[PDB]
Amino acid sequence: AGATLSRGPAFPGMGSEELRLASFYDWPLTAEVPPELLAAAGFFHTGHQDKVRCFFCYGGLQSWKRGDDPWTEHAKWFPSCQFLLRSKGRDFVHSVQET
Numbered sequence: 001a002g003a004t005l006s007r008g009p010a011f012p013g014m015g016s017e018e019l020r021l022a023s024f025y026d027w028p029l030t031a032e033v034p035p036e037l038l039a040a041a042g043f044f045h046t047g048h049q050d051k052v053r054c055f056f057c058y059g060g061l062q063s064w065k066r067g068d069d070p071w072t073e074h075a076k077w078f079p080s081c082q083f084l085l086r087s088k089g090r091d092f093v094h095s096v097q098e099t
């Protein structure tokens with residue numbers, strides 16, 4: 001028993017926070033969350049609205065609102081993301097899942 005999570009990022013080029021930040025050059029005015037927090041949390045901008053995906057797990061999120069924590073949204077939706085886990089740790093993810 002036990003298939004293993006693949007180690008390969010969904011989008012290796014977006015592995016750089018710096019490059020993820022560039023993608024937010026057109027992050028909308030009506031959008032309520034700061035790109036720097038999004039990019040720190042592994043997300044990069046796709047399309048022209050407020051859609052993001054994680055570079056590693058390719059989790060896709062949109063409809064961002066003031067107060068939304070990207071790291072938390074990441075843990076809420078994509079708990080097995082190896083990037084989220086290396087960055088925030090097992091305890092953090094578990095705590096977002098158990099609530």
Ligand SMILES: [Zn+2]
Pocket residue numbers: 042054055056057058059074078081082083084
């Ligand atoms: Zn992820």
